[PDB]
Design a protein around this ligand. Structure first.
Ligand SMILES: Nc1ncnc2c1ncn2[C@@H]1O[C@H](COP(=O)(O)OP(=O)(O)CP(=O)(O)O)[C@@H](O)[C@H]1O
Ligand SMILES: Nc1ncnc2c1ncn2[C@@H]1O[C@H](COP(=O)(O)OP(=O)(O)CP(=O)(O)O)[C@@H](O)[C@H]1O
Ligand SMILES: [Mg+2]
Ligand SMILES: [Mg+2]
Lengths: 171, 171
């Protein structure tokens, strides 16, 4: 059932790195299957985040399995599938990876100052620092041993970010 | 938790009526969320479909509930959610409705003569007649009693269907 002929790409990196804004554009450009993973949490998770609370790792178990399932579905009918999922921790990455030998990660890498500048430029959006500091703390950048991780420089205008993304895709 | 100010539109209709192509531009242009519902089929379904066996109405139970779920999730954080899914039988429509008072359908409506010339329009595609008859055989036209169903006439070129879809959306 796994078409090793088709591929699935997971845009990752903290909140503010560019996942959504670049992924939209790439799928539109290569004309491909794109799925935002924020969309697959179980009804239980939506209420907990709505009740103002942070999901914990157990809550992410069923979500990432759903996403992994969704990875499975996209690559039956598309050669290029993009899924947005910040996936900061190396164990989430293994939850996605399992049974998907054809899934790989594209990591939109930047440092703090760059990503901070990016979110405060959100018109009307009040920017809270602790949130981004938790994102860096949680982030367990994939090492060299994570060999299905490709990497991208977000320090570049979106469109450059876009183009690089396409390259590492067509590379 | 149901944000009655954000809405989900399901692009329904037969296979061939433009569900995915129309929904991608409406998502692009409206800058809104788009989930294609093929991708939420349980690992079981991917295999039943792969082995070649059709799905019955039992195997869609779990899939449409996942989608209903997904609908819930998209409208927490977006005012306009579009979900592609054929939605042929009234029952499938009822199942997506459940829990989601803030959901609606946009019926990419056409007749047989039209959808067929279209599916045949792509090169290298070997078009099977029964496959679309069945489609129409299966179809349970949203009747006038289903008042969250809007309809868009497809006997119109791609762009007016995009434009009309957008109208029913902003209407
Ligand atoms: N290369 C770039 N240059 C300038 N702005 C960029 C950029 N890439 C993304 N942006 C903008 O930066 C902000 C981050 O957006 P984006 O929604 O894509 O990130 P994200 O999806 O990773 C955060 P979230 O997880 O909350 O969705 C947005 O304001 C976006 O328009
Ligand atoms: N209004 C229109 N004018 C011309 N071509 C159109 C059209 N709407 C759709 N198409 C084309 O018609 C065919 C059907 O595409 P599309 O993927 O949207 O159908 P669909 O989503 O209903 C297929 P399926 O349901 O099997 O997933 C494709 O060739 C698409 O490019
Ligand atoms: Mg995002
Ligand atoms: Mg389609």
């Amino acid at each position: 059932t796994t078409n090793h002929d088709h591929h699935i790409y997971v845009l990752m990196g903290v909140s503010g790195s560019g996942k959504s804004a670049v992924a939209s554009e790439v799928a539109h450009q290569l004309h491909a299957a794109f799925l935002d993973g924020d969309f697959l949490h179980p009804r239980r998770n939506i209420e907990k985040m709505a009740s103002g609370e942070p999901l914990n790792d157990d809550d992410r178990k069923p979500w990432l399995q759903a996403l992994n399932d969704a990875a499975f579905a996209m690559q039956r009918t598309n050669k290029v599938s993009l899924i947005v999922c910040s996936a900061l921790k190396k164990h989430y990455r293994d939850l996605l990876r399992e049974g998907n030998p054809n899934l790989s990660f594209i990591y939109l890498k930047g440092d703090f100052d760059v990503i901070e500048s990016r979110l405060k430029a959100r018109k009307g959006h009040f920017f809270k620092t602790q949130m981004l500091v938790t994102q860096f703390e949680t982030l367990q950048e994939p090492g060299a041993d994570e060999t299905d991780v490709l990497v991208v420089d977000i320090d570049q205008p979106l469109e450059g970010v876009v183009a690089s993304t396409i390259e590492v895709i067509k590379k």
